[PDB]
Design a protein around this ligand. Structure first.
Ligand SMILES: CC(=O)N[C@@H]1[C@@H](O[C@@H]2O[C@H](CO)[C@H](O)[C@H](O)[C@H]2O)[C@H](O[C@@H]2O[C@@H](C)[C@@H](O)[C@@H](O)[C@@H]2O)[C@@H](CO)O[C@H]1O
Ligand SMILES: CC(=O)N[C@@H]1[C@@H](O[C@@H]2O[C@H](CO)[C@H](O)[C@H](O)[C@H]2O)[C@H](O[C@@H]2O[C@@H](C)[C@@H](O)[C@@H](O)[C@@H]2O)[C@@H](CO)O[C@H]1O
Lengths: 311, 308
């Protein structure tokens, strides 16, 4: 059978699968009261995409569609009638939680809407509209094919083909950014459907290992970081999709190796459903050498005891 | 090690010159264009060139620390650059500019984010719309600095800052020119470390491009801001991973429809990392949604393609 492999990519050559920015570090922590059930960056080791996961970083937290006016509303002054980010038509009966790439965190997404081009004489960046897309709005119903746009800078024109380019998140006085609380993809109208399952270490002494990025925060979190943590980088998702190598067990043993020295820094379990655990207790940011990378070692027995990750 | 292409349809490819999807394949004669883009440059055996790196999220993005440029009515601040990864940048590095630097003349538009501000400061107050114009005397990424023109919100000096690209802009005196390279060290100095210009040399051939429409936040009313790349980012990354030795100057590739099993057309993928087709005229290709290129065989530079 086709052997399973990982791409050979260092920490600085990986992209967050939940927001279009580079991975900055590996980070482990206990779940505590978080339900870890993100919908972007979900893929099995044999290449089955799940949740709202698709292949392009440029589609993650991006939206496309046609605007419609939303009169009588001080927050969502317009709505965006959605397609898939590819431009392909979207049907709410599609077996997805929401259009692929839809944000998978509760709170406010900030970015720029672009629409019909305007003349040079109209002025600077007049076809760039700063907007908030809040999941706590009753208009956040991407499953049903529509989201609310709250304008901050420049007027959004109704009735134009429009693209939303994400820039970061925001926290206002009553809308905390909660990366592990899923949106209600159908708002008040229906329960979420078609979800990739929640994940947890169930193994003694183990914790999830995350690929961590700091997302820009355009309002709030002064002196704090808006972290977004993914289970797989986009490049791993895409690799597994390409390869479709059959999984020979529940767990692939993987090792973080330094090719300069030839040494293994630590080992981890890569689970068939597409997530990583390490042997460690406590919240801990890993320090890895710049040229280091994970490599597939072997398929292991499900009760395999990892060498402690350590400091 | 055998050479291969990734199996990816037209809607599963990313422009290597701006972080947006490829929309179509397009061929045209060079005419007076010098085709020498610096992003999306990679040999078939996996050698990155120009300002090319692996992450779409780094293309036309900048990172660094801001410094005040008081009294300049265009660039009110500068950005002292690192590599987009955050790694320190030195002008003596053997690159045309920091990896991912824009490789077109004109105005790049996007949003600068800096130190987080309190919730009570107001909506999107840590988001600064800015123009980065290559025709500014402050556009000198090779020497580690670029000019930021704030559209309205105030950019703070002395803060760690990220620029996220959104699109291009055209104002009254700054046309968007995708095949004119910036002066990476400003207008007094010559560009260095450039990936070479490419052109068709066999009779009846033209370059084939992976074409996208970039958002344009000012100008080009009723027109499209095209950005055309020689290789999608996914092909660059694939060749980098594989590092398969090239067995000849040209890889024959065929665009196939897996639903019907038929070949729609064939093309030459050159070892230096660009494609030619047999056609004369500006022409947007129509390809089936599920179609993709596949590697056929190694041939030489003289192979005569079936007309597209
Ligand atoms: C800026 C602000 O604080 N606005 C308050 C409302 O909260 C925003 O409402 C919108 C939707 O309109 C969106 O959820 C934002 O994220 C909020 O910040 C607030 O609206 C009320 O609370 C919301 C959560 C939502 O349930 C909405 O339907 C409801 O009317 C109102 C009322 O408390 O006050 C506004 O100042
Ligand atoms: C908005 C506008 O049209 N401004 C004119 C200036 O052009 C801009 O200059 C800045 C740099 O300061 C930048 O290049 C922009 O892209 C331009 O649009 C214009 O400046 C002159 O022309 C430039 C091309 C540049 O060479 C600059 O150094 C030069 O002074 C001035 C003066 O002609 O008029 C403005 O209206």
């Amino acid at each position: 059978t086709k052997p399973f492999t990982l791409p050979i990519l260092t920490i600085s050559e990986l992209t967050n699968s939940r927001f279009p920015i580079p991975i900055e570090q590996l980070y482990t922590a206990p779940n505590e009261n978080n339900v870890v059930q993100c919908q972007n960056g979900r893929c099995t080791l044999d290449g089955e995409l799940q949740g709202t996961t698709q292949l392009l970083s440029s589609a993650v937290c991006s939206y496309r569609g046609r605007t419609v006016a939303n009169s009588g509303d001080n927050w969502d002054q317009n709505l965006l009638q959605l397609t898939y980010p590819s431009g392909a038509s979207y049907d709410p009966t599609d077996e997805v939680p929401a259009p692929l790439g839809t944000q998978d965190f509760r709170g406010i997404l900030y970015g720029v809407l672009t629409q019909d081009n305007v003349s040079e004489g109209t002025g600077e960046a007049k076809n760039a509209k700063g907007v908030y897309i809040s999941t706590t709005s009753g208009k956040f119903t991407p499953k049903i094919g529509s989201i609310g746009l709250h304008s901050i800078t420049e007027n959004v024109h109704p009735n134009q083909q429009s693209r939303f380019t994400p820039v970061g998140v925001a926290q206002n006085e009553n809308t905390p950014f909660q990366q592990w609380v899923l949106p209600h993809y159908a708002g008040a109208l229906a329960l979420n459907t078609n979800l990739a399952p929640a994940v947890a270490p169930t193994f003694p002494g183990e914790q999830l290992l995350f690929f961590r990025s700091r997302v820009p925060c355009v309002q709030g979190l002064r002196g704090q970081d808006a972290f977004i943590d993914c289970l797989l980088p986009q490049e791993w998702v895409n690799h597994f999709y390409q390869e479709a190598a059959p999984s020979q067990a529940d767990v692939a043993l993987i090792r973080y190796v330094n090719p300069d020295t030839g040494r293994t820094l630590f080992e981890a379990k890569l689970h068939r459903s597409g997530f990583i655990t390490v042997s460690h207790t406590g919240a801990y940011p890993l320090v890895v050498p710049p040229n280091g990378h994970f490599r597939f070692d072997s398929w292991v027995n499900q009760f395999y005891s990892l060498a402690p990750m350590g400091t």
